[PDB]
Design a protein around this nucleic acid. Structure first.
Length: 74
DNA sequence: ATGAATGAAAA
DNA sequence: TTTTCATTCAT
């Protein structure tokens, strides 16, 4: 099963979700998601375009390690 | 034990 | 609107 290439904020979330959870004691993982969104807005273009470069580099190797793959929504 | 909903974005 | 990750919470 070929899954979609990760977004930029998806990579961000993967790298910082645990952190947000540790730094907001026993919160809900949806408030964790929200705070992750806040962190993403408050992030400087400096690293935002780094996560963007990461998303590009994952996307290329997804469009070549899987030829003829489409964004199919049922 | 299985599904819902929280977040950004490219499609 | 859909879905990529993750996961508490609700069912």
């Amino acid at each position: 099963h070929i899954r979609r290439p990760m977004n930029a904020f998806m990579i961000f979330s993967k790298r910082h979700r645990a952190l947000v959870h540790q730094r907001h004691p026993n919160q809900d993982n949806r408030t964790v998601s929200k705070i992750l969104g806040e962190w993403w807005y408050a992030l400087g273009p400096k690293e935002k375009q780094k996560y963007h470069d990461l998303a590009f580099q994952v996307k290329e190797a997804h469009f070549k390690a899987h030829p003829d793959w489409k964004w199919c929504n049922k």
